[PDB]
Amino acid sequence: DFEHAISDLEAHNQAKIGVALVSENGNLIQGYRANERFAMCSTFKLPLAALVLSRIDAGEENPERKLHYDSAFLEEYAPAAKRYVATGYMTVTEAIQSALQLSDNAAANLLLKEVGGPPLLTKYFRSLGDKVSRLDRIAPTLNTNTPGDERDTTTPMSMAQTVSKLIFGDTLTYKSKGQLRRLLIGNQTGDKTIRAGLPDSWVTGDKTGSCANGGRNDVAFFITTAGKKYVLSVYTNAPELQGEERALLIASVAKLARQYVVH
């Protein structure tokens, strides 16, 4: 069965793994430690982009608005923000794309400043029905992945359910939904994680996260050849593996999920 298989992977790897596979309507199909708390890491940027798109939907935000910043706003990992900084801004669109596809921390932090900070992202989660996910810090200190710390955390089911509502439910307009989906499909950081375990005929979009204390996470949506729609969340702590082995670990979880996914 599915839960014993993940348990076996936990054993070989001396790792903690949380996984949730959820349907188009948010029902848990298979899970393992699906209700345990893990650090979100950069997976929070997916809901953050969704909040900004929701503000665009409501007319409260303009995709072309200039978000002004200077050198002091940059982060150690902020490859797009470093490129744009001499111009004095990134547009909302450029910040969304950079935060999602590159995981640019400064792009994310510009978006957080615009939505009213970690507390307003937490409120957005609550407004979707997610009872668990919470942001408290800005990037990157939210990556600390400390034991027993509940700041900046979700559960595999919460996040997968949240993402199924965004990607497949009615939270976003058709335009925003389609943009979020296409942005996530063009994610540049996830080729070795969940996608690597899924057949290349399936449409897949994802957002990864890498944290301290061996933290490596991915959440993906996919659409099968039959047209069946799913979200898979994989949250892992594997402080003994090397980075490439942490990505292999996630891909292996995804292979098991692939197996289970059927007509």
Q: What does the binding site for Br ion look like in residue numbers (CB under 5 A)?
A: 42, 139
Catalytic residue among 7, 23, 42, 164: 42
| Least distance from Br ion to the Cβ atom of residue 41, Å | 6
* Sheet architecture: strand order including 229-237: 28-32, 16-23, 229-237, 215-223, 203-210
Residue 9 or residue 139: which is nearer to Br ion going by CB?
Answer: 139
Complex with Br ion: residue 42 or 237, whichever CB lies closer: 42
Q: What are the structure tokens assigned to 105, written together?
A: 């921390």
- Are 180 and 169 in contact by the 8 Å Cβ rule? The answer is no
Q: Between 139 and 157, whose beta carbon lies closer to Br ion?
A: 139
User: 10 Å Cβ neighbour count for 138?
Assistant: 16
Return the CA Rg of the chain: 17
Question: Measured from the CB atom, is 42 or 158 closer to Br ion?
Answer: 42
Q: Tell me, what DSSP letter sits at residue 137?
A: S
* CB of 107 or CB of 160, closer to Br ion: 107
Q: Which two tokens stand for residue 238?
A: 């594997």
Q: Residue 61 to residues 58, 64, 108, 129, 177: CA-CA distances in angstroms?
A: 8, 9, 16, 23, 16
CB of 180 to Br ion, least distance (A): 18
Distance, CA of 225 to CA of 221 (rounded, Å): 14
- Gap between the Cα atoms of 91 and 74, Å rounded: 16
**CB of residue 106 vs Br ion: minimum separation in angstroms?**
11
Cis peptide before 140 (omega within 30 of 0): yes
Is 103 annotated in the active site? Answer: no
Q: What is the nearest approach in angstroms of Br ion to the Cβ of residue 142?
A: 6
CB of 86 to Br ion, least distance (A): 24
253, 196 Cβ separation under 8 angstroms: no
* Residues designated catalytic: 42
